[PDB]
């Protein structure tokens, strides 16, 4: 199956306190493997998964230098952006950045990303072809022009297509015991009438990895459903995930309805009966 | 592996 590697950076200015809170996190698929928090005592890039602890001190020194560089560039950005948006020193503002790689089942490059946001909105992004910039407004055009003069997109093209996929491949290999696994979901059926009869029903799924699941409700019909409630995938903490989908049906005991569960690794699209 | 190029100020 496909895989990805991505890094998330958030910097929040806190005027009247000092430097901005800066938090950086790295993921391989849905697994966090590194982090950096400007308020932590460590002041080092920290491992958050066993297979990354295999890298030597040279690697950690480098990641730490780079992540601090990122931090300080974002601190300069905060000052520059206030100017661009003609805003005051008193207000707290946020800068965000994300970039990464996607590869297919063949572990070959599929697509890259590099985007930036200001105060929760798109500011500038690198287009799908990794050659053009999507600038949100006038301020971002300024940035766009300087990033073009300095060939930022050529540099990111080199990182995203080469370095990021080469390292994604290395990480998948080093942690094949964890990253290259697949945990099947433990499904269930819960329907309570409690006070008023009218029975309901949702497809449970526990302890599954990765987080991608496409469960849906229907009875002997085609892929079309209409409801007003369902829950998004959520973390369990042990590294796994859990989700469900609700739909309303006629009163009485449990009727005859099929649940289509789609998850990777899983032998075949599971559909729990439980008619008692 | 963090990017070590293509990261500039806005």
């Amino acid at each position, epitope marked *: 199956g496909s895989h990805s590697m991505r890094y998330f950076f958030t910097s929040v200015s806190r005027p009247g306190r000092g*430097e901005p809170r800066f938090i950086a996190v790295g993921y391989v698929d849905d697994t966090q493997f590194v982090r950096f928090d400007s308020d932590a005592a460590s002041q080092r890039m920290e491992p958050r998964a066993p297979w990354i602890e295999q890298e030597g001190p*040279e*690697y950690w*020194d*480098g*990641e*730490t*230098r*780079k992540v*601090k*560089a*990122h931090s*300080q*560039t974002h*601190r*300069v950005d905060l000052g520059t952006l206030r100017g661009y948006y003609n805003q005051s020193e008193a207000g707290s503002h946020t800068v965000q950045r994300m970039y990464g790689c996607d590869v297919g089942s063949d572990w070959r490059f599929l697509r890259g990303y590099h985007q930036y946001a200001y105060d929760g909105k798109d500011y500038i992004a690198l287009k799908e072809d990794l050659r053009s910039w999507t600038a949100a407004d006038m301020a971002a055009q300024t940035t766009k022009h300087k990033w073009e003069a*300095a*060939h*930022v997109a050529e*540099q990111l093209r*080199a*990182y995203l297509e*080469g*370095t990021c996929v080469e*390292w994604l491949r290395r990480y998948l290999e080093n942690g094949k015991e964890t990253l290259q696994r697949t945990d099947a979901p433990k499904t269930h059926m819960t329907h309570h009438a409690v006070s008023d009869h009218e029975a309901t029903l949702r497809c449970w799924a526990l302890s599954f990895y990765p987080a991608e699941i496409t469960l849906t409700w229907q009875r002997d019909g085609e892929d079309q459903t209409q409801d007003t409630e369902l829950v998004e995938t959520r973390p369990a903490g042990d590294g796994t995930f859990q989700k469900w989908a609700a739909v309303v049906v006629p009163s009485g005991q449990e009727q005859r309805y099929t649940c289509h569960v789609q998850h990777e690794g899983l032998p075949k699209p599971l559909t729990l009966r439980w008619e008692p | *592996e963090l*990017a*070590a*190029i*293509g*990261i*500039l*100020t806005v």
Partner: T-cell receptor, first 116, second 109 residues
Framework: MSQTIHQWPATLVQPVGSPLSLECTVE??????LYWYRQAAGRGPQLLFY??????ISSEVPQNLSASRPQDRQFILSSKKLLLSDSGFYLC?????????????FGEGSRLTVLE | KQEVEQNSGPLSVPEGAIASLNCTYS??????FFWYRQYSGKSPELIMF????GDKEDGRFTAQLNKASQHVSLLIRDSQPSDSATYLC?????????FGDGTTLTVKP
């Protein structure tokens, strides 16, 4: 109008135990990365300090040496008491804010000879 | 050091010939590479940088990068005596440059 980097003094001959003060200035860019290297004969420059625009990023901790950055474009290397070992060719360098291809130029260096 | 290795030389090359300077690095995460020229008693002067596979030509200088073998080269075309100097190879291993000890070149007129 363009980008420049200067260093001084150019050469120093000084006794063991003496204080040291080298300066580095840059013009034509703002919020740059600043670096202090030391070069021994027959070898490549070795990193002493790497400061980003708001402070020190490098973890090396030399002996008798400290760096400071009183202004955005002013970088200082000091010692309160030099050791014979501190002889060397001290080089300052800069790079643009962030992690990019801009800059990476050295100043003209400061040759220091410490004598017993 | 050992992180970045270059032959020391002195490497002699006739005037008019191509000088081939080589460099090996051991830091897998290196994403950019640089070549400096250093005249005796002087500070290093930047020649080129590269961050992608293959060749990159700038006048008579051609840097070649091969990441699989972790090798970086510099070819000087139509060498001259004024090219006599020590050529430094540097690798960016984060937010800084790490240097080799250089390869001293001598071009006989």
């Amino acid at each position: 109008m363009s980008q420049t980097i200067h260093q001084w003094p150019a050469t120093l001959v000084q006794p063991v135990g003496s204080p040291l003060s080298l300066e580095c200035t840059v013009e034509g860019t703002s919020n740059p990365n600043l670096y202090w290297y030391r070069q021994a004969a027959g070898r490549g420059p070795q990193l002493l300090f790497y400061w980003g625009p708001f402070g020190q990023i490098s973890s090396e901790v030399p002996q008798n040496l400290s760096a400071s950055r009183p202004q955005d474009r002013q970088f200082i290397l000091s010692s309160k008491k030099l050791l014979l070992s501190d002889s060397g060719f001290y080089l300052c360098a800069w790079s643009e804010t962030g992690l990019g291809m801009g800059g990476w130029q050295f100043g003209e260096g400061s040759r220091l000879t410490v004598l017993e | 050091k050992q992180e970045v290795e270059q032959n020391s030389g002195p490497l002699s090359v006739p005037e008019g010939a191509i000088a081939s300077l080589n460099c090996t690095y051991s830091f897998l995460g290196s994403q950019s590479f640089f070549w400096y020229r250093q005249y005796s008693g002087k500070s290093p002067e930047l020649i080129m940088f590269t961050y992608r596979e293959g060749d990159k030509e700038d006048g008579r200088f051609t840097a070649q990068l091969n990441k699989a073998s972790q090798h970086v080269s510099l070819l000087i075309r139509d060498s001259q005596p004024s090219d006599s100097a020590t050529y430094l190879c540097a690798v960016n291993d984060g937010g800084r440059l790490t240097f080799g000890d250089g390869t001293t070149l001598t071009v006989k007129p």
